[PDB]
Amino acid sequence: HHPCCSNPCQNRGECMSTGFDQYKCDCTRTGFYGENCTTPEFLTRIKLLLKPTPNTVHYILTHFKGVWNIVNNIPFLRSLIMKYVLTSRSYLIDSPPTYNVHYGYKSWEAFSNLSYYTRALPPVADDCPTPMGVKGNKELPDSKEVLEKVLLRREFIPDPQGSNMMFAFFAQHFTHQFFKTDHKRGPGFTRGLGHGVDLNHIYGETLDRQHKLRLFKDGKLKYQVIGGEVYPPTVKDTQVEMIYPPHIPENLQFAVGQEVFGLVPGLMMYATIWLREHNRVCDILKQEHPEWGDEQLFQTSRLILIGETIKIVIEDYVQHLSGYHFKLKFDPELLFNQQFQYQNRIASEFNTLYHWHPLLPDTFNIEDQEYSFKQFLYNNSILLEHGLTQFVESFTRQIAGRVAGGRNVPIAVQAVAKASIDQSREMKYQSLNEYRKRFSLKPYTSFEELTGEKEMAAELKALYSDIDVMELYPALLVEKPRPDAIFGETMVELGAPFSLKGLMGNPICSPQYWKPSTFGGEVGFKIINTASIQSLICNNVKGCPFTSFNV
Amino acid sequence: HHPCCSNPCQNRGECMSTGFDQYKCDCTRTGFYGENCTTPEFLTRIKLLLKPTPNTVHYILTHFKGVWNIVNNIPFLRSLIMKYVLTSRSYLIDSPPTYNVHYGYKSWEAFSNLSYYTRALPPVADDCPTPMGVKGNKELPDSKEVLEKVLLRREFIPDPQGSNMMFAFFAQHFTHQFFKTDHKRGPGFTRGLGHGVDLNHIYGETLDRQHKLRLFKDGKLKYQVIGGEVYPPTVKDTQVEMIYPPHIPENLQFAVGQEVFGLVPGLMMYATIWLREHNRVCDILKQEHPEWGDEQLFQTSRLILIGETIKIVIEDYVQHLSGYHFKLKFDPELLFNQQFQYQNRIASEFNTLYHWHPLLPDTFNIEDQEYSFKQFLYNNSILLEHGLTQFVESFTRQIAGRVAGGRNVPIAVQAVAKASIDQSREMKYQSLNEYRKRFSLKPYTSFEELTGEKEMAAELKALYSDIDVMELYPALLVEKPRPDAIFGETMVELGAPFSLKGLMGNPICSPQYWKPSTFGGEVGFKIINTASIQSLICNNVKGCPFTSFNVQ
Ligand code: COH
Ligand code: COH
Ligand SMILES: *[C@@H]1O[C@H](CO)[C@@H](O[C@@H]2O[C@H](CO)[C@@H](O[C@H]3O[C@H](CO)[C@@H](O)[C@H](O)[C@@H]3O)[C@H](O)[C@H]2NC(C)=O)[C@H](O)[C@H]1NC(C)=O
Ligand SMILES: *[C@@H]1O[C@@H](CO)[C@@H](O[C@@H]2O[C@H](CO)[C@@H](O)[C@H](O)[C@H]2NC(C)=O)[C@H](O)[C@H]1NC(C)=O
Ligand SMILES: *[C@@H]1O[C@H](CO)[C@@H](O[C@@H]2O[C@H](CO)[C@@H](O)[C@H](O)[C@H]2NC(C)=O)[C@H](O)[C@H]1NC(C)=O
Ligand SMILES: *[C@@H]1O[C@H](CO)[C@@H](O[C@@H]2O[C@H](CO)[C@@H](O)[C@H](O)[C@H]2NC(C)=O)[C@H](O)[C@H]1NC(C)=O
Ligand SMILES: CC/C=C\C/C=C\C/C=C\C/C=C\C/C=C\C/C=C\CCC(=O)O
Ligand SMILES: CC/C=C\C/C=C\C/C=C\C/C=C\C/C=C\C/C=C\CCC(=O)O
Ligand SMILES: CCCCCCCCO[C@@H]1O[C@H](CO)[C@@H](O)[C@H](O)[C@H]1O
Ligand SMILES: CCCCCCCCO[C@@H]1O[C@H](CO)[C@@H](O)[C@H](O)[C@H]1O
Ligand SMILES: *[C@@H]1O[C@H](CO)[C@@H](O)[C@H](O)[C@H]1NC(C)=O
């Protein structure tokens, strides 16, 4: 079998077979040397002794509120800290990207083919004696067993951080512009060739689709007016393909950028909001530039919305997730004097860690009504009957579920959660502990250590036998959360690097893009730099309801 | 008309309409301010006082031969200078890329659609009163007139730098992996979506084409053996689509990565050499890695040949062009402590400046035979009759034409030279002086300053009327050359930044790729770092003939 099956190389060293039973580790720029890159250099040894553990940095950022109030209000100091935050996490991502599901060694195919999700860790070789390499049993525990014993929801566990359904549907809507798995090809493949925040979920992946969604007057997107209220146009009027079951009336078959957004009224809510926002921006730009044509009005509005998205995602969305007292800042200028690659490639593992199905509640509470999953799916008449205003008011009030801590995946989505385990195995994912080492974390030495608890640990112990063969995905959902937090260590220390690369690696953040002329002047630039989840709703939802990402 | 037609914004500021009749310059990070980004900042005043002219910099590098011989033999000094060569030049390129033929403003279409060549300078707006903006006549001079008067060759003008046919065909072969204009779509469109040195001209642009060219054993490419010599496989054997006229029979229809390389035997020579090289690397890798399968063998060989190409382009090809006494170095480690984007987008203007048709000779001299263009075109029989050994020997010793200096485009390719002018015009290119400013160069104040000569300068003024409406492409071919040099100032100062960016911006130069493991260990890595035009020939051509890019 492959000599690298045991993953002998440490500290981001690279394994290469040198014969049927021999390997060699490449320790170049790891800061380590020796057969397995285990011996540290003098500079590295001191650097290791001083580096605070992720849980210590988390403590500081979620305590000393009085000091953070001061830091947050000194621009020079706030910028300095945000600069470290960005740079320290960006470094953990390979850019230009390296491996994918088919290539556990660097290759031009892996680099050039945008149809693949990239991979933070190479896949386990096909001929390895064990699913994870050398350790554990010949088969991983049955995925259904794992799901039922440690993942499925017994009782609904609310998020201690206060996350609401406004946040939950935002996460789903937003992340679904770059998580577009090509099922015709396989789970290691994507339909989102932009590999980041291009807003294809509003505008369409292809030009052909974009043009069916456009009005071609004043730069705007097509729309319909039902009961005085602006909604996306129909499948019939646009000839835009959407996923809908055949029983749904032509009227409620809304056509938007992303084919799957008719699945959930919550997604259609943000689809309508962003559609309204783009047309609102077109009106603003048409007044600033009465001399501009439709094409520039559209293009310029798109870039502004990309700006709004990255701004809202950092300063509202990530801010809320973080639980920090420190105010995260969206400012491209922070990287202008730093070494940073303005490019991104969506990692398969980023996709997997983002399967936050526990967020989903048992019922969807709108006004006085409580809708079940069956009632809620594909039902756009709920959005029409209640209206966006009510939808915002209700989902701001309804708490979402805790992601970590175990046993909170709703039964309605059991098949999806099982799929997340199966496809991980199909894609030959390395173990949780390997992913932890890859992201500078000390590997878990027991199931009790991972879970911070006793019952789920015991079950997992009987299923996997060895902590070093625990899988990434189920571990993220069973992990001990941070104090009163939605996630545990692994979720954050993997998610944040992937997250920040995709946000800052956007072209609009590059020095040659980050200037007022890119966005139609100061007026367009102003829209970005003052954008918030509150302003987004206020500008586009009748009666400007209050909103946030917490209850 | 559009308020930015006059190109009012200077020093890299960006123009934006602010009404039907008014504009605004965005002077962000230009180092200048004011209405037209003309008022320099204090730090910028100091920088413009200390920075030497490109002509001064060229002089130092092409003189003091003894000093550079010391510099080239102290590794630290050589590394320090090469570092500046790369950095001082790379800020001149927008990366991520900005404009294209359809977008004079930054947009997502422009950034995300890889089918476009990018643009170093936005196109002149459609509604502008004159083709160049506001200056000049309603129409530009007839392209035929510009071609006939100052471009077409009379007496053959050899390149004083001594560039040979080995250089000419290498240039043609190497650049045609990234200059692949999509003529069904338009001149502003490319079919090379890799936008750089991916060797698609050897391996194919698509996966289906690659798979028809591969042997699927030992990581090799398909081939045939004619008279003991390894040559590309046929169209009949591979089912790989190639551009061949009807009269060309099945046997002489070689299938290679790039569909037009059958056009010229000179290109097929390099296609055959590189095909042999790939398969030679596979053998080396097989010996190092008996456990490796076909796919990895092929993949890592590709990565090695990409490395070899970049090595040869910098240390032989560009080295020769530059005419420097200073030895250029391919070393990615030099950029690891620098701000640099490992990405590239081929610029339309880079394509245009690379139409070096004056390089082409009147006839192609091989052994005792002098072949005319008609005799040479689409004729791989010539290749088989003489063999690659005689091709290298003959082409190594035949001199190329001088590109700059005017009146040196062969008549045989006159329709091509005309097309470059016509296509620049439909692509709405800005004037020469606008591109010169774009690249930190002083605009020419007269046609005599452009040529350094009286006769052509007179012909040009009678056609263009104003120096500020002179087109970029014809200007490059008529430009006053540097002393005893193949090119003039504009060619180099535009070409060099596009080039280095294309080469160093390759992902194999990034810290995570620039490791022995990427190339199958230290032996694979050594093949990249010791590559040269001579070794390429020596390793793959019977008898190991001597070669270089100059005579002889
Ligand atoms: C952000 C949190 C979140 C939420 C709230 C959510 C809520 C819901 C929901 C109820 C409203 C339904 C019916 C679905 C249904 C699906 N989910 Co999500 N999902 C979420 C995170 C994800 C992500 C991320 C993916 C991967 C997308 C992909 O691969 O296409 C996913 C996968 C899926 C898929 C693709 C199948 C696959 O194999 O990946 C479907 C269908 N699920 N989801
Ligand atoms: C680098 C120097 C060089 C040389 C030596 C050279 C030698 C020759 C040559 C004799 C060997 C002939 C018959 C031609 C003829 C042509 N040249 Co070149 N060309 C050169 C530089 C270029 C470049 C660069 C392009 C742009 C390629 C493209 O696809 O637009 C080009 C374009 C062309 C085209 C149109 C592109 C197409 O797809 O057909 C033709 C025809 N020509 N050239
Ligand atoms: C990116 O990677 C994809 C996966 O390798 C690749 O899709 C694959 O394309 C090949 C060739 O186009 C298909 O293989 C087919 O080749 C023979 C040719 O004779 C056909 O008769 C068969 O249909 C055979 O399947 C693969 O089917 C296909 N793999 C899939 C669907 O997963 C993409 O082409 C690559 N992307 C680019 C732009 O190159
Ligand atoms: C910024 O723009 C330039 C033109 O690009 C210049 O405007 C022109 O000034 C000329 C005299 O110097 C006039 O002949 C001409 O009327 C005018 N062109 C216009 C406005 O259409 C401005 O002077 C210059 N501004 C500054 C501050 O120097
Ligand atoms: C590098 O790693 C290899 C394989 O992980 C080490 O070989 C192992 O050594 C340990 C302790 O002596 C044994 O438990 C294993 O039996 C050995 N190999 C295997 C496959 O089990 C090797 O010692 C390491 N190199 C150094 C010097 O640290
Ligand atoms: C990149 O741009 C080109 C040109 O706009 C796009 O090609 C056009 O596609 C539309 C709709 O599919 C066709 O109707 C036209 O015939 C095409 N125009 C041409 C050939 O000039 C191309 O689709 C774009 N690429 C991507 C990835 O969207
Ligand atoms: C293409 C990718 C672009 C954007 C990424 C999208 C969303 C990112 C949001 C969350 C990422 C996943 C898990 C949590 C990780 C980080 C956010 C929370 C806390 C960490 C704060 C920090 O240090 O950045
Ligand atoms: C993707 C593109 C990558 C590489 C292009 C390869 C070769 C380009 C060669 C010539 C272009 C034309 C003119 C200048 C070219 C090279 C520089 C020559 C002299 C100046 C030396 C220097 O300052 O680097
Ligand atoms: C509501 C859906 C849950 C069905 C669980 C079926 C698998 C049984 O799982 C068991 O669940 C018990 C109750 O939490 C735990 O005490 C046990 O540790 C666990 O093994
Ligand atoms: C030996 C030719 C060098 C001088 C030519 C410059 C004048 C251009 O003359 C042109 O030459 C073309 C090529 O035959 C012809 O097609 C044109 O009809 C002719 O006018
Ligand atoms: C859709 O929503 C309506 C209320 O708007 C609800 O009464 C109905 O039952 C739902 N449809 C389905 C099929 O559940």
- DSSP state letters, A281-330: HHHHHHHH-TT--HHHHHHHHHHHHHHHHHHHIIIIIIHHHHT-SS----
* Residues contacting residue B224 through CB under 8 Å, at least 6 positions apart: B230, B231, B232, B233, B234, B237
What's the CA gap between B413 and B398, in Å, rounded?
Answer: 19
* Residues contacting residue A241 through CB under 8 Å, at least 6 positions apart: A235, A259
**B335 C-beta closer than 6 A to ligand 8:** no
Whether B108 and A302 lie within 8 Å, measured CB to CB: yes
What's the CA gap between B324 and A209, in Å, rounded?
Answer: 52
CA atoms within 13 A on the CB side of A524: 31
What's the CA gap between B202 and B224, in Å, rounded?
Answer: 16
> Is the same domain home to A431 and A287?
yes
Two tokens, residue B503: 């080469």
**A379 C-beta closer than 6 A to ligand 11:** yes
DSSP one-letter code for A53? P
Which residue is catalytic, options A231, A354, A429, A464?
A354
> Is the same domain home to B29 and B100?
no
Inter-residue long-range contacts of B41-50, CB under 8 Å, 24+ positions, other chains counted: none
Q: B209 exposed, middle or buried (CB, 10 Å; 0-12, 13-18, 19+)?
A: buried
What's the CA gap between B220 and B238, in Å, rounded?
Answer: 14
Q: Where are the alpha helices (DSSP H) in B342-454?
A: 348-353, 373-376, 381-397, 414-426, 432-438, 447-451
Q: A73 exposed, middle or buried (CB, 10 Å; 0-12, 13-18, 19+)?
A: exposed
The three-class DSSP label of residue B181 is strand
Instruction: Please give, rounded to a whole number of angstroms, the shortest distance from the CA of A113 to a CA of chain B.
Output: 9
> Is the same domain home to B50 and B165?
yes
Which has the closest alpha carbon to A456: A154, A250, A24, A185? Answer: A154
> Cα A131 vs. chain centroid, distance in angstroms?
27
> Is the same domain home to A18 and A166?
no
Domain extent at residue A23: 1-41
* b/e map A362-390, b = 16+ CB within 10 Å: eebbbeeeeeebeebebbbebbbebbbeb
What's the CA gap between A323 and A162, in Å, rounded?
Answer: 10
What's the CA gap between A509 and B177, in Å, rounded?
Answer: 30
What's the CA gap between B154 and A295, in Å, rounded?
Answer: 48
Q: Is B452 on the interface with A (CB under 8 A)?
A: no
Ligand nearest to the CA of B509: 8
> Is the same domain home to A6 and A98?
no
**A367 C-beta closer than 6 A to ligand 5:** no
Of B103, B510, B516, nearest to A96 by CB-CB distance is B510
Amino acid letter for position A266? G
Concatenating the DSSP letter of every residue in A474-529 gives HHHHHSPBSTT-SSBHHHHHHHHHHHHHHHHTSGGGSTTT-SGGGGTSHHHHHHHH
- Residues in B closer than 8 angstroms to A109, CB to CB, are 207, 299
Q: Is A176 a catalytic residue?
A: yes
> Is the same domain home to B94 and B242?
yes
What's the CA gap between A40 and B448, in Å, rounded?
Answer: 65
CATH number of the domain within which B127 lies:
1.10.640.10
Q: State which approach was used to obtain the coordinates.
A: X-ray
Contact between A540 and A280 under an 8 Å Cβ cutoff? The reply is yes
Whether B511 and A29 lie within 8 Å, measured CB to CB: yes
The three-class DSSP label of residue B31 is coil
What's the CA gap between B166 and B371, in Å, rounded?
Answer: 16
What's the CA gap between B488 and A471, in Å, rounded?
Answer: 62
> Cα A179 vs. chain centroid, distance in angstroms?
8
Ligand nearest to the CA of A408: 9
Q: Which residue has the tokens 């309603």?
A: B138
A89 is annotated as contributing to ligand binding: yes
> Is the same domain home to A412 and A536?
yes
Name beta bridge partners: B234. B254
Inter-residue long-range contacts of B97-104, CB under 8 Å, 24+ positions, other chains counted: B97/B345, B97/B347, B98/A512, B98/A513, B99/B123, B100/B188, B100/B348, B101/B186, B101/B187, B101/B188, B101/B189, B101/B348, B101/B427, B101/B428, B102/B188, B103/A299
- Cβ–Cβ contacts within 10 Å for residue A226, how many? 11
Q: B266 exposed, middle or buried (CB, 10 Å; 0-12, 13-18, 19+)?
A: buried
Name beta bridge partners: A224. A231
A379 CA to centre of ligand 11 in angstroms: 6
What resolution does the deposited structure have, in angstroms?
A: 2.7
Total residue count of chain A as it appears in this document = 551
DSSP one-letter code for A337? T
Which residues of chain A from 188 to 227 reach within 8 Å of chain B, CB to CB? 194, 198, 207
Q: A349 exposed, middle or buried (CB, 10 Å; 0-12, 13-18, 19+)?
A: buried
Q: Which residue has the tokens 């008022």?
A: B39
The total number of structural domains that make up chain B:
2
Contact between A334 and A314 under an 8 Å Cβ cutoff? The reply is no
What's the CA gap between A291 and B23, in Å, rounded?
Answer: 11
- Cβ–Cβ contacts within 10 Å for residue B546, how many? 12
Q: What share of chain B is helix, strand, coil (3-state, %, to 5)?
A: 45, 10, 45
* b/e map B407-426, b = 16+ CB within 10 Å: bbbbebbbeebbebbbbbbe
What element of type H or E holds B366? strand B364-366
Residues of B assigned a catalytic role: 176, 354
> Is the same domain home to A18 and A150?
no
Residue nearest to atom 1 of ligand 3 (CA): A113
**A206 C-beta closer than 6 A to ligand 6:** yes
What's the CA gap between A340 and A166, in Å, rounded?
Answer: 32
Contact between A455 and A131 under an 8 Å Cβ cutoff? The reply is no
What element of type H or E holds A224? strand A224-226
**A322 C-beta closer than 6 A to ligand 7:** yes
What's the CA gap between A516 and B15, in Å, rounded?
Answer: 11
> Is the same domain home to A54 and A32?
no
Which residues of chain A from 501 to 520 reach within 8 Å of chain B, CB to CB? 507, 510-513, 515-518, 520
What's the CA gap between B306 and B202, in Å, rounded?
Answer: 10
Contact between A307 and A531 under an 8 Å Cβ cutoff? The reply is yes
Contact between A485 and A160 under an 8 Å Cβ cutoff? The reply is yes
Contact between A506 and A194 under an 8 Å Cβ cutoff? The reply is no
Inter-residue long-range contacts of B508-512, CB under 8 Å, 24+ positions, other chains counted: B508/B303, B508/B306, B508/B307, B508/B310, B508/B332, B509/B310, B509/B332, B509/B335, B509/B342, B510/A95, B510/A96, B510/B332, B510/B342, B511/A29, B511/B332, B511/B336, B512/A94, B512/A95, B512/A96, B512/A98
> Is the same domain home to B463 and B480?
yes
- Residues in B closer than 8 angstroms to A198, CB to CB, are 108, 112
What's the CA gap between A485 and B434, in Å, rounded?
Answer: 58
Two tokens, residue A441: 């974390």
* b/e map B3-34, b = 16+ CB within 10 Å: bbbbbbbbbbbbbbbeeeeebbbbbbebbbbe
Number of inter-chain CB pairs under 8 A, A vs B: 141
Whether A17 and B515 lie within 8 Å, measured CB to CB: no
> Is the same domain home to A20 and A73?
no
**A295 C-beta closer than 6 A to ligand 6:** no
Which has the closest alpha carbon to B416: B230, B218, B127, B152? Answer: B152
> Is the same domain home to A345 and A476?
yes
The three-class DSSP label of residue B123 is coil
Whether B513 and A106 lie within 8 Å, measured CB to CB: yes
